[PDB]
Enzyme design. Structure first.
Site, PDB file in Angstrom:
ATOM      1  N   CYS A  46      -5.777  -0.833  -8.137  1.00 14.44           N
ATOM      2  CA  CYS A  46      -5.775  -0.969  -6.683  1.00 14.44           C
ATOM      3  C   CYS A  46      -7.169  -0.723  -6.093  1.00 14.44           C
ATOM      4  O   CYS A  46      -8.165  -1.229  -6.615  1.00 14.44           O
ATOM      5  CB  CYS A  46      -4.739  -0.021  -6.066  1.00 14.44           C
ATOM      6  SG  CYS A  46      -4.702   1.635  -6.797  1.00 14.44           S
ATOM      7  N   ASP A  59       0.822  -1.209   0.000  1.00 17.13           N
ATOM      8  CA  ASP A  59       0.000   0.000   0.000  1.00 17.13           C
ATOM      9  C   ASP A  59       0.859   1.263   0.000  1.00 17.13           C
ATOM     10  O   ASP A  59       1.550   1.559   0.976  1.00 17.13           O
ATOM     11  CB  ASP A  59      -0.958  -0.006   1.198  1.00 17.13           C
ATOM     12  CG  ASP A  59      -2.121   0.959   1.031  1.00 17.13           C
ATOM     13  OD1 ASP A  59      -2.470   1.302  -0.120  1.00 17.13           O
ATOM     14  OD2 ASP A  59      -2.694   1.376   2.060  1.00 17.13           O
TER      15      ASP A  59
END
Lengths: 149, 156, 149, 156
Positions: free
Chosen positions: B101, B69
Protein backbone atom coordinates in the site's frame (compact mmCIF):
# COMPACT_ATOMS: atom_id res chain seq x y z
CA UNK A 1 23.56 26.24 37.62
CA UNK A 2 25.76 23.11 37.33
CA UNK A 3 23.20 21.34 39.54
CA UNK A 4 20.42 22.16 37.07
CA UNK A 5 22.75 21.02 34.28
CA UNK A 6 23.37 17.62 35.93
CA UNK A 7 19.59 17.17 36.26
CA UNK A 8 19.39 18.10 32.56
CA UNK A 9 21.51 15.10 31.53
CA UNK A 10 19.56 12.90 33.97
CA UNK A 11 16.33 14.09 32.30
CA UNK A 12 17.72 12.90 28.95
CA UNK A 13 16.61 9.29 29.50
CA UNK A 14 12.99 10.02 30.46
CA UNK A 15 12.27 13.14 28.40
CA UNK A 16 11.18 12.34 24.85
CA UNK A 17 11.71 14.05 21.49
CA UNK A 18 7.99 14.97 21.62
CA UNK A 19 8.57 17.05 24.79
CA UNK A 20 11.13 19.28 23.17
CA UNK A 21 10.34 19.50 19.44
CA UNK A 22 9.29 22.56 17.47
CA UNK A 23 5.89 21.99 15.80
CA UNK A 24 5.94 22.29 12.05
CA UNK A 25 4.18 25.66 11.70
CA UNK A 26 6.84 27.36 13.85
CA UNK A 27 9.77 25.86 11.90
CA UNK A 28 11.86 27.65 9.27
CA UNK A 29 10.96 25.75 6.12
CA UNK A 30 11.51 26.31 2.40
CA UNK A 31 9.28 25.29 -0.51
CA UNK A 32 10.97 23.30 -3.29
CA UNK A 33 9.63 25.75 -5.89
CA UNK A 34 11.12 28.62 -3.94
CA UNK A 35 13.65 30.40 -6.15
CA UNK A 36 16.96 31.51 -4.60
CA UNK A 37 16.93 35.22 -5.44
CA UNK A 38 18.60 37.91 -3.30
CA UNK A 39 15.52 38.15 -1.05
CA UNK A 40 15.25 34.40 -0.42
CA UNK A 41 19.02 33.94 0.06
CA UNK A 42 19.15 36.78 2.61
CA UNK A 43 16.17 35.21 4.39
CA UNK A 44 18.23 32.01 4.65
CA UNK A 45 21.26 34.00 5.90
CA UNK A 46 19.14 35.88 8.47
CA UNK A 47 17.33 32.75 9.72
CA UNK A 48 20.23 31.49 11.85
CA UNK A 49 19.70 27.93 10.64
CA UNK A 50 22.49 26.08 8.83
CA UNK A 51 20.18 23.14 8.07
CA UNK A 52 16.76 23.96 6.59
CA UNK A 53 13.93 21.55 5.61
CA UNK A 54 12.71 21.60 2.01
CA UNK A 55 9.08 20.62 1.35
CA UNK A 56 6.87 19.97 -1.68
CA UNK A 57 3.28 21.30 -1.66
CA UNK A 58 2.50 20.84 2.05
CA UNK A 59 4.91 21.47 4.94
CA UNK A 60 4.42 17.97 6.40
CA UNK A 61 5.84 16.56 3.15
CA UNK A 62 9.58 17.11 3.71
CA UNK A 63 11.62 16.05 0.68
CA UNK A 64 15.22 17.23 1.16
CA UNK A 65 17.32 19.43 3.42
CA UNK A 66 19.22 22.54 2.40
CA UNK A 67 22.62 22.95 4.04
CA UNK A 68 24.41 26.32 3.90
CA UNK A 69 27.41 24.80 2.11
CA UNK A 70 24.99 24.00 -0.74
CA UNK A 71 24.64 27.73 -1.42
CA UNK A 72 28.28 27.92 -2.42
CA UNK A 73 28.30 29.13 -6.03
CA UNK A 74 24.70 30.18 -6.52
CA UNK A 75 24.48 33.40 -8.41
CA UNK A 76 21.39 34.97 -6.77
CA UNK A 77 20.89 37.03 -9.95
CA UNK A 78 20.32 34.19 -12.44
CA UNK A 79 17.53 32.69 -10.62
CA UNK A 80 18.21 29.14 -9.43
CA UNK A 81 15.21 27.36 -7.88
CA UNK A 82 15.83 25.41 -4.66
CA UNK A 83 14.74 22.07 -6.15
CA UNK A 84 17.72 21.93 -8.53
CA UNK A 85 20.16 22.79 -5.72
CA UNK A 86 18.69 19.97 -3.60
CA UNK A 87 19.40 17.71 -6.59
CA UNK A 88 23.07 18.80 -6.53
CA UNK A 89 23.75 17.34 -3.08
CA UNK A 90 22.80 14.23 -1.13
CA UNK A 91 21.74 15.22 2.37
CA UNK A 92 19.99 12.15 3.83
CA UNK A 93 16.86 12.79 5.90
CA UNK A 94 16.92 11.96 9.62
CA UNK A 95 13.55 10.68 10.85
CA UNK A 96 12.85 10.04 14.53
CA UNK A 97 9.83 8.62 16.38
CA UNK A 98 8.07 10.81 18.95
CA UNK A 99 8.65 8.43 21.88
CA UNK A 100 12.45 8.37 21.42
CA UNK A 101 14.29 9.40 24.59
CA UNK A 102 16.69 12.32 24.29
CA UNK A 103 19.90 10.38 25.00
CA UNK A 104 19.10 8.03 22.10
CA UNK A 105 18.68 11.01 19.75
CA UNK A 106 21.78 12.73 21.17
CA UNK A 107 23.76 9.59 20.32
CA UNK A 108 22.01 9.47 16.93
CA UNK A 109 23.32 12.98 16.21
CA UNK A 110 26.75 11.77 17.37
CA UNK A 111 26.63 8.68 15.12
CA UNK A 112 26.71 10.91 12.03
CA UNK A 113 23.01 11.37 11.22
CA UNK A 114 21.59 14.80 10.45
CA UNK A 115 21.61 17.41 13.22
CA UNK A 116 18.09 18.18 12.17
CA UNK A 117 15.88 15.29 13.18
CA UNK A 118 12.27 15.30 11.99
CA UNK A 119 9.60 13.89 14.27
CA UNK A 120 6.87 11.36 13.44
CA UNK A 121 4.27 9.44 15.42
CA UNK A 122 2.09 6.46 14.47
CA UNK A 123 -1.46 7.52 13.62
CA UNK A 124 -4.27 5.02 14.23
CA UNK A 125 -7.11 7.45 14.86
CA UNK A 126 -9.00 8.03 11.65
CA UNK A 127 -10.40 5.42 9.38
CA UNK A 128 -7.61 4.75 6.86
CA UNK A 129 -4.34 2.85 7.02
CA UNK A 130 -1.92 3.85 9.80
CA UNK A 131 0.52 6.51 8.64
CA UNK A 132 3.51 8.29 10.14
CA UNK A 133 2.40 11.79 11.13
CA UNK A 134 4.89 14.66 10.98
CA UNK A 135 4.77 16.58 14.27
CA UNK A 136 7.72 18.78 13.72
CA UNK A 137 11.48 19.05 14.18
CA UNK A 138 14.09 18.56 16.89
CA UNK A 139 17.77 19.52 16.58
CA UNK A 140 21.10 18.83 18.26
CA UNK A 141 20.74 22.46 19.41
CA UNK A 142 17.35 21.66 21.00
CA UNK A 143 18.82 18.75 22.99
CA UNK A 144 21.85 20.77 24.17
CA UNK A 145 19.43 23.43 25.46
CA UNK A 146 17.88 20.75 27.70
CA UNK A 147 21.25 20.44 29.46
CA UNK A 148 22.40 24.06 29.47
CA UNK A 149 19.18 25.37 30.75
CA UNK B 1 9.80 10.04 1.86
CA UNK B 2 9.30 9.08 5.50
CA UNK B 3 8.01 5.86 4.03
CA UNK B 4 9.90 3.05 5.75
CA UNK B 5 12.36 0.71 4.00
CA UNK B 6 11.42 -2.60 2.33
CA UNK B 7 11.06 -5.23 5.06
CA UNK B 8 11.95 -8.85 4.38
CA UNK B 9 9.66 -11.30 6.13
CA UNK B 10 10.63 -14.96 5.75
CA UNK B 11 8.69 -17.73 7.50
CA UNK B 12 8.45 -21.48 6.72
CA UNK B 13 10.58 -21.36 3.54
CA UNK B 14 8.57 -18.59 1.94
CA UNK B 15 9.52 -14.93 1.64
CA UNK B 16 7.77 -11.55 1.62
CA UNK B 17 8.59 -7.91 1.05
CA UNK B 18 6.48 -5.17 2.56
CA UNK B 19 7.21 -1.92 0.71
CA UNK B 20 5.86 1.59 0.11
CA UNK B 21 4.28 3.18 -2.92
CA UNK B 22 6.95 4.77 -5.14
CA UNK B 23 6.49 7.61 -7.56
CA UNK B 24 7.75 7.37 -11.15
CA UNK B 25 10.42 9.90 -10.11
CA UNK B 26 11.69 7.41 -7.51
CA UNK B 27 10.88 4.31 -9.37
CA UNK B 28 14.13 2.67 -10.53
CA UNK B 29 15.58 2.59 -7.01
CA UNK B 30 12.33 0.88 -5.99
CA UNK B 31 12.79 -1.69 -8.78
CA UNK B 32 16.45 -2.07 -7.79
CA UNK B 33 15.20 -2.74 -4.25
CA UNK B 34 12.93 -5.53 -5.50
CA UNK B 35 15.49 -7.49 -7.52
CA UNK B 36 18.11 -7.09 -4.77
CA UNK B 37 15.57 -8.91 -2.59
CA UNK B 38 14.78 -11.14 -5.58
CA UNK B 39 11.02 -10.73 -5.88
CA UNK B 40 9.16 -12.32 -8.80
CA UNK B 41 5.92 -10.65 -7.81
CA UNK B 42 4.40 -7.30 -6.79
CA UNK B 43 0.91 -6.76 -5.39
CA UNK B 44 -0.41 -3.21 -5.40
CA UNK B 45 -3.22 -2.97 -2.85
CA UNK B 46 -3.57 0.80 -3.13
CA UNK B 47 -4.46 2.83 -6.23
CA UNK B 48 -1.88 3.29 -9.01
CA UNK B 49 0.52 6.23 -8.82
CA UNK B 50 3.13 4.77 -11.13
CA UNK B 51 3.56 3.01 -14.48
CA UNK B 52 3.87 -0.72 -13.75
CA UNK B 53 5.58 -1.42 -17.08
CA UNK B 54 9.18 -0.43 -16.19
CA UNK B 55 8.82 -2.83 -13.23
CA UNK B 56 7.18 -5.44 -15.49
CA UNK B 57 9.96 -5.18 -18.11
CA UNK B 58 12.43 -6.03 -15.34
CA UNK B 59 10.44 -9.27 -15.15
CA UNK B 60 8.35 -8.81 -12.02
CA UNK B 61 4.68 -9.82 -12.21
CA UNK B 62 2.77 -6.72 -11.03
CA UNK B 63 -0.81 -7.14 -9.81
CA UNK B 64 -3.29 -4.36 -9.05
CA UNK B 65 -5.64 -5.52 -6.29
CA UNK B 66 -6.87 -2.30 -4.63
CA UNK B 67 -9.28 -2.31 -1.74
CA UNK B 68 -10.49 0.34 0.70
CA UNK B 69 -8.08 2.45 2.76
CA UNK B 70 -7.87 0.74 6.16
CA UNK B 71 -10.24 -2.12 5.33
CA UNK B 72 -9.92 -5.83 5.88
CA UNK B 73 -9.20 -7.68 2.62
CA UNK B 74 -12.52 -8.52 0.90
CA UNK B 75 -12.97 -12.22 0.33
CA UNK B 76 -11.96 -12.29 -3.34
CA UNK B 77 -8.67 -10.48 -2.70
CA UNK B 78 -7.53 -12.87 0.06
CA UNK B 79 -8.76 -15.82 -2.06
CA UNK B 80 -6.65 -14.71 -5.04
CA UNK B 81 -3.75 -13.81 -2.72
CA UNK B 82 -3.38 -17.35 -1.34
CA UNK B 83 -3.77 -18.84 -4.83
CA UNK B 84 -1.08 -16.45 -6.09
CA UNK B 85 1.37 -17.57 -3.39
CA UNK B 86 0.85 -21.23 -4.32
CA UNK B 87 1.49 -20.54 -8.03
CA UNK B 88 4.50 -18.29 -7.43
CA UNK B 89 6.34 -20.51 -4.95
CA UNK B 90 5.68 -23.19 -7.50
CA UNK B 91 7.31 -20.82 -9.99
CA UNK B 92 10.46 -19.98 -8.11
CA UNK B 93 11.10 -21.78 -4.81
CA UNK B 94 12.47 -19.16 -2.38
CA UNK B 95 11.56 -16.11 -4.37
CA UNK B 96 9.92 -13.17 -2.58
CA UNK B 97 6.47 -11.63 -3.03
CA UNK B 98 6.26 -7.84 -2.69
CA UNK B 99 3.17 -6.12 -1.37
CA UNK B 100 2.66 -2.38 -1.06
CA UNK B 101 0.00 0.00 0.00
CA UNK B 102 0.83 3.65 0.60
CA UNK B 103 3.52 3.01 2.94
CA UNK B 104 3.41 -0.65 3.89
CA UNK B 105 1.64 0.02 7.08
CA UNK B 106 -1.85 -1.11 6.60
CA UNK B 107 -3.41 -3.43 4.07
CA UNK B 108 -0.18 -4.84 2.63
CA UNK B 109 0.94 -6.13 6.08
CA UNK B 110 -2.51 -7.71 6.58
CA UNK B 111 -2.08 -9.89 3.48
CA UNK B 112 1.38 -10.96 4.71
CA UNK B 113 0.17 -11.53 8.30
CA UNK B 114 -2.82 -13.57 7.11
CA UNK B 115 -0.46 -15.66 4.97
CA UNK B 116 1.67 -16.31 8.08
CA UNK B 117 -1.41 -17.43 10.04
CA UNK B 118 -2.49 -19.75 7.19
CA UNK B 119 1.03 -21.24 7.20
CA UNK B 120 0.61 -21.75 10.96
CA UNK B 121 1.93 -18.89 12.81
CA UNK B 122 -0.32 -18.08 15.74
CA UNK B 123 -1.98 -14.71 15.22
CA UNK B 124 -0.41 -12.68 18.05
CA UNK B 125 3.08 -13.80 16.99
CA UNK B 126 2.35 -12.85 13.37
CA UNK B 127 1.35 -9.28 14.33
CA UNK B 128 4.34 -8.80 16.66
CA UNK B 129 6.76 -10.16 14.03
CA UNK B 130 5.62 -7.53 11.51
CA UNK B 131 5.29 -4.75 14.12
CA UNK B 132 8.82 -5.49 15.37
CA UNK B 133 10.38 -4.43 12.05
CA UNK B 134 7.57 -2.24 10.75
CA UNK B 135 6.40 0.04 13.53
CA UNK B 136 2.71 0.76 14.14
CA UNK B 137 1.60 -1.48 11.34
CA UNK B 138 -2.06 -2.52 11.58
CA UNK B 139 -5.11 -0.47 12.59
CA UNK B 140 -8.10 -1.37 14.79
CA UNK B 141 -10.23 -2.99 12.07
CA UNK B 142 -7.40 -5.03 10.57
CA UNK B 143 -6.24 -6.29 13.96
CA UNK B 144 -9.84 -7.40 14.58
CA UNK B 145 -9.95 -9.07 11.16
CA UNK B 146 -6.69 -10.89 11.97
CA UNK B 147 -8.06 -11.97 15.36
CA UNK B 148 -11.34 -13.28 13.94
CA UNK B 149 -9.59 -14.94 10.98
CA UNK B 150 -9.46 -18.74 10.99
CA UNK B 151 -7.10 -20.80 8.80
CA UNK B 152 -7.94 -24.06 7.22
CA UNK B 153 -4.23 -24.14 6.33
CA UNK B 154 -4.42 -23.75 2.54
CA UNK B 155 -0.79 -23.39 1.53
CA UNK B 156 0.81 -26.64 0.46
CA UNK C 1 27.67 8.31 28.64
CA UNK C 2 25.48 10.42 30.99
CA UNK C 3 28.07 9.73 33.71
CA UNK C 4 30.82 11.23 31.55
CA UNK C 5 28.47 14.13 30.81
CA UNK C 6 27.88 14.84 34.52
CA UNK C 7 31.66 14.87 35.04
CA UNK C 8 31.83 17.28 32.07
CA UNK C 9 29.71 19.89 33.88
CA UNK C 10 31.70 19.27 37.08
CA UNK C 11 34.90 19.90 35.09
CA UNK C 12 33.48 23.29 34.05
CA UNK C 13 34.61 25.03 37.25
CA UNK C 14 38.24 23.83 37.21
CA UNK C 15 38.92 23.61 33.47
CA UNK C 16 39.98 26.94 31.97
CA UNK C 17 39.41 28.59 28.60
CA UNK C 18 43.13 27.95 27.89
CA UNK C 19 42.58 24.17 28.14
CA UNK C 20 39.99 24.11 25.41
CA UNK C 21 40.75 26.97 22.99
CA UNK C 22 41.76 26.70 19.35
CA UNK C 23 45.14 28.40 18.77
CA UNK C 24 45.06 31.22 16.28
CA UNK C 25 46.80 29.49 13.36
CA UNK C 26 44.15 26.73 13.32
CA UNK C 27 41.21 29.18 13.37
CA UNK C 28 39.09 30.20 10.39
CA UNK C 29 39.96 33.86 10.00
CA UNK C 30 39.37 36.50 7.33
CA UNK C 31 41.58 39.44 6.37
CA UNK C 32 39.88 42.86 6.31
CA UNK C 33 41.18 43.48 2.78
CA UNK C 34 39.70 40.18 1.67
CA UNK C 35 37.14 40.86 -1.06
CA UNK C 36 33.84 38.94 -0.99
CA UNK C 37 33.84 37.39 -4.46
CA UNK C 38 32.18 34.05 -5.31
CA UNK C 39 35.28 32.13 -4.17
CA UNK C 40 35.57 33.87 -0.80
CA UNK C 41 31.81 33.75 -0.11
CA UNK C 42 31.68 30.01 -0.85
CA UNK C 43 34.69 29.53 1.44
CA UNK C 44 32.65 31.24 4.18
CA UNK C 45 29.63 29.03 3.37
CA UNK C 46 31.76 25.86 3.39
CA UNK C 47 33.60 26.74 6.62
CA UNK C 48 30.72 25.78 8.94
CA UNK C 49 31.26 28.89 11.05
CA UNK C 50 28.46 31.44 11.47
CA UNK C 51 30.78 33.82 13.34
CA UNK C 52 34.17 34.54 11.77
CA UNK C 53 37.01 36.77 13.08
CA UNK C 54 38.20 39.63 10.87
CA UNK C 55 41.82 40.76 11.22
CA UNK C 56 44.00 43.59 9.90
CA UNK C 57 47.59 42.79 8.81
CA UNK C 58 48.41 40.10 11.40
CA UNK C 59 46.02 37.40 12.65
CA UNK C 60 46.54 38.34 16.32
CA UNK C 61 45.10 41.78 15.52
CA UNK C 62 41.36 40.98 15.44
CA UNK C 63 39.30 44.03 14.50
CA UNK C 64 35.70 42.93 13.88
CA UNK C 65 33.61 39.78 13.49
CA UNK C 66 31.68 38.72 10.41
CA UNK C 67 28.30 37.15 11.10
CA UNK C 68 26.49 35.23 8.34
CA UNK C 69 23.48 37.56 8.51
CA UNK C 70 25.88 40.33 7.42
CA UNK C 71 26.20 38.63 4.02
CA UNK C 72 22.55 39.30 3.30
CA UNK C 73 22.49 41.46 0.16
CA UNK C 74 26.09 41.24 -1.00
CA UNK C 75 26.28 40.82 -4.72
CA UNK C 76 29.37 38.58 -5.01
CA UNK C 77 29.83 39.88 -8.57
CA UNK C 78 30.38 43.58 -7.81
CA UNK C 79 33.21 43.04 -5.54
CA UNK C 80 32.55 44.22 -1.98
CA UNK C 81 35.57 44.07 0.34
CA UNK C 82 35.00 42.67 3.84
CA UNK C 83 36.08 45.86 5.61
CA UNK C 84 33.09 47.84 4.32
CA UNK C 85 30.66 45.06 5.34
CA UNK C 86 32.17 45.07 8.86
CA UNK C 87 31.44 48.81 8.88
CA UNK C 88 27.76 48.10 8.08
CA UNK C 89 27.13 46.20 11.33
CA UNK C 90 28.11 46.52 14.97
CA UNK C 91 29.20 43.13 16.27
CA UNK C 92 30.98 43.82 19.59
CA UNK C 93 34.13 41.79 20.29
CA UNK C 94 34.10 39.31 23.18
CA UNK C 95 37.49 39.12 24.92
CA UNK C 96 38.23 36.56 27.63
CA UNK C 97 41.27 35.95 29.85
CA UNK C 98 43.05 32.59 29.62
CA UNK C 99 42.50 31.67 33.29
CA UNK C 100 38.70 32.06 33.10
CA UNK C 101 36.89 28.89 34.19
CA UNK C 102 34.47 27.37 31.70
CA UNK C 103 31.28 27.95 33.71
CA UNK C 104 32.06 31.69 33.84
CA UNK C 105 32.44 31.77 30.04
CA UNK C 106 29.35 29.60 29.55
CA UNK C 107 27.38 32.15 31.57
CA UNK C 108 29.10 34.94 29.61
CA UNK C 109 27.77 33.40 26.38
CA UNK C 110 24.35 33.19 28.08
CA UNK C 111 24.46 36.84 29.20
CA UNK C 112 24.34 37.97 25.56
CA UNK C 113 28.03 38.36 24.68
CA UNK C 114 29.43 36.92 21.46
CA UNK C 115 29.43 33.14 21.04
CA UNK C 116 32.93 33.53 19.76
CA UNK C 117 35.16 34.47 22.65
CA UNK C 118 38.76 35.43 21.89
CA UNK C 119 41.46 34.48 24.37
CA UNK C 120 44.19 36.67 25.86
CA UNK C 121 46.82 36.25 28.56
CA UNK C 122 49.00 38.81 30.35
CA UNK C 123 52.55 38.87 28.96
CA UNK C 124 55.37 39.90 31.30
CA UNK C 125 58.21 37.94 29.71
CA UNK C 126 60.06 40.17 27.30
CA UNK C 127 61.45 43.57 28.01
CA UNK C 128 58.64 45.97 27.06
CA UNK C 129 55.38 46.96 28.70
CA UNK C 130 52.99 44.13 29.60
CA UNK C 131 50.52 43.45 26.79
CA UNK C 132 47.53 41.16 26.30
CA UNK C 133 48.64 38.28 24.09
CA UNK C 134 46.13 36.66 21.73
CA UNK C 135 46.28 32.88 22.17
CA UNK C 136 43.31 31.99 20.10
CA UNK C 137 39.56 31.44 20.20
CA UNK C 138 36.98 29.55 22.25
CA UNK C 139 33.28 29.20 21.33
CA UNK C 140 29.98 28.26 22.92
CA UNK C 141 30.33 25.16 20.70
CA UNK C 142 33.74 24.38 22.26
CA UNK C 143 32.30 24.54 25.80
CA UNK C 144 29.27 22.37 24.92
CA UNK C 145 31.69 19.75 23.54
CA UNK C 146 33.28 19.58 27.02
CA UNK C 147 29.92 18.34 28.36
CA UNK C 148 28.75 16.15 25.48
CA UNK C 149 31.99 14.35 25.17
CA UNK D 1 41.16 46.71 19.99
CA UNK D 2 41.70 44.37 22.94
CA UNK D 3 42.99 47.49 24.62
CA UNK D 4 41.13 47.80 27.92
CA UNK D 5 38.66 50.59 28.76
CA UNK D 6 39.60 53.92 30.40
CA UNK D 7 40.00 53.31 34.14
CA UNK D 8 39.12 56.03 36.63
CA UNK D 9 41.44 56.11 39.62
CA UNK D 10 40.49 58.61 42.33
CA UNK D 11 42.46 58.88 45.57
CA UNK D 12 42.71 61.75 48.10
CA UNK D 13 40.54 64.21 46.12
CA UNK D 14 42.53 63.85 42.92
CA UNK D 15 41.56 61.88 39.82
CA UNK D 16 43.29 59.87 37.09
CA UNK D 17 42.44 58.14 33.85
CA UNK D 18 44.56 55.29 32.54
CA UNK D 19 43.80 54.82 28.84
CA UNK D 20 45.12 53.20 25.65
CA UNK D 21 46.67 54.67 22.55
CA UNK D 22 43.97 55.48 19.98
CA UNK D 23 44.39 55.71 16.24
CA UNK D 24 43.10 58.72 14.29
CA UNK D 25 40.43 56.36 12.92
CA UNK D 26 39.19 55.76 16.48
CA UNK D 27 40.00 59.13 17.84
CA UNK D 28 36.75 61.02 18.49
CA UNK D 29 35.33 58.24 20.68
CA UNK D 30 38.60 58.47 22.63
CA UNK D 31 38.12 62.25 23.01
CA UNK D 32 34.47 61.66 23.95
CA UNK D 33 35.76 59.24 26.60
CA UNK D 34 38.04 61.93 28.05
CA UNK D 35 35.46 64.71 28.43
CA UNK D 36 32.87 62.26 29.78
CA UNK D 37 35.43 61.61 32.52
CA UNK D 38 36.21 65.35 32.51
CA UNK D 39 39.97 65.36 31.96
CA UNK D 40 41.81 68.66 31.46
CA UNK D 41 45.05 66.88 30.69
CA UNK D 42 46.56 64.06 28.61
CA UNK D 43 50.05 62.63 28.99
CA UNK D 44 51.36 60.52 26.13
CA UNK D 45 54.20 58.35 27.44
CA UNK D 46 54.52 56.31 24.26
CA UNK D 47 55.37 57.57 20.76
CA UNK D 48 52.77 59.50 18.75
CA UNK D 49 50.36 57.58 16.54
CA UNK D 50 47.73 60.29 16.34
CA UNK D 51 47.28 64.02 15.74
CA UNK D 52 46.99 65.68 19.17
CA UNK D 53 45.25 68.75 17.74
CA UNK D 54 41.65 67.43 17.52
CA UNK D 55 42.05 66.51 21.21
CA UNK D 56 43.69 69.89 21.92
CA UNK D 57 40.89 71.81 20.17
CA UNK D 58 38.44 70.09 22.54
CA UNK D 59 40.45 71.90 25.23
CA UNK D 60 42.57 69.13 26.71
CA UNK D 61 46.24 69.90 27.37
CA UNK D 62 48.14 67.11 25.58
CA UNK D 63 51.74 66.41 26.62
CA UNK D 64 54.21 64.14 24.83
CA UNK D 65 56.59 62.64 27.39
CA UNK D 66 57.82 59.38 25.81
CA UNK D 67 60.26 57.10 27.52
CA UNK D 68 61.48 53.56 26.85
CA UNK D 69 59.08 50.63 26.43
CA UNK D 70 58.92 48.93 29.84
CA UNK D 71 61.29 51.33 31.60
CA UNK D 72 60.99 53.12 34.91
CA UNK D 73 60.25 56.83 34.43
CA UNK D 74 63.55 58.73 34.04
CA UNK D 75 64.02 61.40 36.65
CA UNK D 76 62.98 64.38 34.52
CA UNK D 77 59.68 62.77 33.48
CA UNK D 78 58.58 61.99 37.06
CA UNK D 79 59.81 65.46 38.14
CA UNK D 80 57.66 67.17 35.48
CA UNK D 81 54.78 64.75 36.18
CA UNK D 82 54.44 65.78 39.84
CA UNK D 83 54.80 69.46 38.94
CA UNK D 84 52.08 69.02 36.30
CA UNK D 85 49.67 67.52 38.83
CA UNK D 86 50.20 70.47 41.19
CA UNK D 87 49.52 73.02 38.43
CA UNK D 88 46.50 71.17 37.01
CA UNK D 89 44.70 70.51 40.30
CA UNK D 90 45.34 74.17 40.90
CA UNK D 91 43.68 74.73 37.52
CA UNK D 92 40.54 72.70 38.01
CA UNK D 93 39.94 71.14 41.44
CA UNK D 94 38.59 67.62 40.82
CA UNK D 95 39.47 67.38 37.17
CA UNK D 96 41.11 64.20 35.88
CA UNK D 97 44.54 63.65 34.35
CA UNK D 98 44.74 61.10 31.52
CA UNK D 99 47.84 59.03 30.91
CA UNK D 100 48.33 56.53 28.11
CA UNK D 101 50.99 54.27 26.81
CA UNK D 102 50.15 51.60 24.26
CA UNK D 103 47.48 50.10 26.20
CA UNK D 104 47.62 51.53 29.69
CA UNK D 105 49.42 48.59 31.06
CA UNK D 106 52.90 49.67 31.65
CA UNK D 107 54.45 53.09 31.97
CA UNK D 108 51.21 55.08 32.26
CA UNK D 109 50.14 53.08 35.37
CA UNK D 110 53.60 53.65 36.90
CA UNK D 111 53.15 57.43 36.79
CA UNK D 112 49.70 57.08 38.41
CA UNK D 113 50.95 54.56 41.01
CA UNK D 114 53.94 56.75 41.90
CA UNK D 115 51.57 59.71 42.31
CA UNK D 116 49.47 57.60 44.72
CA UNK D 117 52.58 56.72 46.76
CA UNK D 118 53.64 60.39 46.89
CA UNK D 119 50.13 61.27 48.13
CA UNK D 120 50.58 58.56 50.79
CA UNK D 121 49.27 55.36 49.63
CA UNK D 122 51.55 52.54 50.71
CA UNK D 123 53.18 50.94 47.69
CA UNK D 124 51.63 47.45 47.79
CA UNK D 125 48.13 48.95 48.07
CA UNK D 126 48.83 51.28 45.14
CA UNK D 127 49.82 48.38 42.85
CA UNK D 128 46.85 46.22 43.89
CA UNK D 129 44.41 49.12 43.42
CA UNK D 130 45.52 49.56 39.80
CA UNK D 131 45.86 45.81 39.13
CA UNK D 132 42.34 45.24 40.51
CA UNK D 133 40.74 47.24 37.69
CA UNK D 134 43.53 46.98 35.13
CA UNK D 135 44.72 43.40 34.96
CA UNK D 136 48.41 42.50 34.72
CA UNK D 137 49.50 46.09 34.82
CA UNK D 138 53.17 46.53 35.76
CA UNK D 139 56.22 44.51 34.69
CA UNK D 140 59.23 43.31 36.70
CA UNK D 141 61.35 46.47 36.35
CA UNK D 142 58.51 48.88 37.11
CA UNK D 143 57.39 46.92 40.16
CA UNK D 144 61.00 47.10 41.38
CA UNK D 145 61.09 50.84 40.67
CA UNK D 146 57.85 51.27 42.64
CA UNK D 147 59.25 49.21 45.52
CA UNK D 148 62.53 51.16 45.69
CA UNK D 149 60.75 54.51 45.26
CA UNK D 150 60.64 56.78 48.30
CA UNK D 151 58.27 59.76 48.65
CA UNK D 152 59.11 62.98 50.31
CA UNK D 153 55.39 63.73 49.87
CA UNK D 154 55.55 66.53 47.28
CA UNK D 155 51.90 67.09 46.42
CA UNK D 156 50.31 69.90 48.40
Amino acid sequence: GPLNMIQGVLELRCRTVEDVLTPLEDCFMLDASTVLDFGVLASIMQSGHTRIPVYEEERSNIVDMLYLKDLAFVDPEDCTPLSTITRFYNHPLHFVFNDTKLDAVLEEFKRGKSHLAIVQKVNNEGEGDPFYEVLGLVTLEDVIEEIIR
Amino acid sequence: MNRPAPVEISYENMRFLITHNPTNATLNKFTEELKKYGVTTLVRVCDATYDKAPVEKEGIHVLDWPFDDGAPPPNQIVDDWLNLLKTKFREEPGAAVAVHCVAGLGRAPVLVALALIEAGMKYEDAVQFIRQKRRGAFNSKQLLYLEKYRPKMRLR
